[PDB]
């Protein structure tokens, strides 16, 4: 079970969804559009990967049923509706396109933005595109600073606004202008630490399930301790038995 | 148990202290935001404050309350910056004795609008009400990017809902929870979405009684009722099911019987296997006959 189990057992609610898509599994009934959870078949490279993505989209919104097209929203869960508690995503368009193709207007060769280093399912890439916007969304690995930030913050010539999301190591900073203010763009800093979700890495392997895995051998190992006990009881049933039909 | 276990006695067990909010976010910052806040006011223009104290519970009234508590508690800390080397200083001093915290850092201005035209007016009390705030621009600047007191809210089944269903016009959302332990933020046409909020006793919540639980009376009967008949029916099972196995240990016994008067059997089997036999008379006496 390569498929991420322990991590999802970490939630009553989420429990819940394991159930939901256990059934769903189970029946193969007619799937036009398989949904599966983002959280499930997206792998990050390292933790702060998995930070990263897990920052770009809502918690809430992590822990969604994926829809590709809003024509089929309601077709899919239908019957699970009331049984168990769970969530969905909506999509409609967006784009794929990623910045910088080509040599452009800088020199810098500083990584690149935040479509590179995921991989998924098709609908789980198109849910994350659409809900996170990859492609506007730009990491560096080195030297970054919001001083870079605010000589940007200048109104781009690609618009006036200058993003909507960016995020970096431990910091993700918000652009966003005043409606009813001074039309100044007041940009947001929040510290974000580490998550385990939408991570390539097999539940949390620090201290996994191990423990019990140690206990469930340590009982193996004792039942089969009983065995022998019992196959030596056995042994002695047949030289009870010998002894009756020497009796005999 | 473990659903009302961390708060049996905890909430009782103040100290009859006042607790703040300050180390209620985390144990960290009370002794040192007494000496921190003059250095965040320093930097730049005055630091607004965390808003911890600035919206607070009014009256206990919590349970509308917590569905608008959890939407400003998802960005609640408001610290105002303007260079990123002084946001890099203070993210430093920050670092002081240690934070294991995310604080947000929202330096948006203040917005003017009014807010009252939007909202329908009705008997039930409008949720913010239910909150106390000191300056309503403070809100408002967050109340503009989304619109908290237009949406109605309402328990899970109830009238004036659907209107997402309905779809607005002049309106914007008509969203709201469904339970007061987690309610499902209402959409009608599209999927709800849960909200959790987090309980904690930062006011004086307690000024008329400091008695155990007087809240939570209610959901530690309900449960201890729901205990009480899933215990019920599991005796009954359990009733059942031994009163079967007591059955087939008599018949058991029976069969045990049974086996053991077999046992007889063959006992006399063989004693009258030993047994003289007085035949050779009546044959002598047949050849004889004969």
């Known amino acids: 079970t390569t498929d991420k189990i322990g991590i999802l057992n970490q939630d009553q609610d989420l429990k819940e969804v394991r159930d939901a898509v256990l059934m769903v599994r189970e029946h193969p009934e007619m799937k036009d559009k398989i949904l599966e959870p983002p959280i499930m078949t997206v792998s990050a490279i390292n933790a702060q990967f998995a930070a990263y993505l897990a920052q770009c989209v809502d918690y809430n919104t992590s822990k969604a049923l994926t829809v590709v097209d809003s024509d089929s929203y309601k077709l899919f869960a239908n019957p699970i509706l009331d049984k168990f508690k769970v969530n969905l995503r909506e999509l409609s368009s967006a784009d794929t396109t990623p910045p910088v193709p080509a040599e452009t207007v800088r020199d810098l060769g500083f990584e690149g933005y935040l479509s590179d280093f995921i991989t998924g399912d098709k609908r789980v890439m198109k849910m994350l595109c659409q809900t996170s916007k990859i492609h506007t969304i730009p990491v560096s690995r080195r030297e970054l600073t919001p001083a870079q930030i605010k000589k940007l913050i200048t109104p781009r010539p690609n618009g006036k606004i200058l993003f909507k999301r960016i995020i970096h190591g431990n910091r993700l900073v918000d652009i966003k202008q005043s409606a009813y203010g001074s039309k100044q763009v007041f940009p947001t800093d929040v510290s974000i630490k580490q998550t385990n979700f939408y991570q390539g890495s097999i539940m949390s392997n620090e201290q996994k399930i191990r423990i019990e895995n140690e206990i469930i051998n340590l009982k193996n190992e004792y039942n089969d301790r009983k065995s022998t006990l019992d196959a030596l009881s056995n042994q002695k049933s047949g030289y009870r038995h010998e002894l009756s039909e020497l009796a005999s | ?290």
């Open chain 2, 1 to 290: 148990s473990r659903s009302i276990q961390n708060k049996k006695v905890e909430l009782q067990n103040i100290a009859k202290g006042n607790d703040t909010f300050l180390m209620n976010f985390d144990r960290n910052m009370d002794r040192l935001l007494r000496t921190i806040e003059q250095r965040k006011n320093e930097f730049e223009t005055p630091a607004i404050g965390p808003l911890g104290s600035l919206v607070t519970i009014r009256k206990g009234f919590e349970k509308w309350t917590r569905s608008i508590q959890r939407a400003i508690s998802s960005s609640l800390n408001a610290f105002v910056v303007s260079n990123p080397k002084d946001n890099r200083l203070f993210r430093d001093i920050m670092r002081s004795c240690g934070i294991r915290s995310n604080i947000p850092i929202v330096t948006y201005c203040l917005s003017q609008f009014d807010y009252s035209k939007g909202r329908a007016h009705g008997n039930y009390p409008t949720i913010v009400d239910a909150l106390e705030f000191s300056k309503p621009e403070i809100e408002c600047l967050f109340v503009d990017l989304s619109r908290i007191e237009r949406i109605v809210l309402i328990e899970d089944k109830n009238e004036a809902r659907n209107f997402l269903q309905r779809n607005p016009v002049n309106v914007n959302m008509a969203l709201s929870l469904r339970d007061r332990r987690s309610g499902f933020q209402l959409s009608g046409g599209y999927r709800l979405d849960t909200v959790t909020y987090q309980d904690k006793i930062r006011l004086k919540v307690n000024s008329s009684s400091d008695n155990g639980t007087q809240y939570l009376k209610d959901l530690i009967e309900q449960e201890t009722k729901e205990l009480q008949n899933i215990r019920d029916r599991y005796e009954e099972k359990l009733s059942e099911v031994r009163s079967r196995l007591k059955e087939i240990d008599g018949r058991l016994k029976s069969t045990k019987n049974e086996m053991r008067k077999t046992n007889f059997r063959m006992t006399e089997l063989k004693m009258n296997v030993g047994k003289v036999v007085d035949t050779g008379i009546l044959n002598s006496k047949i050849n004889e006959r004969k």
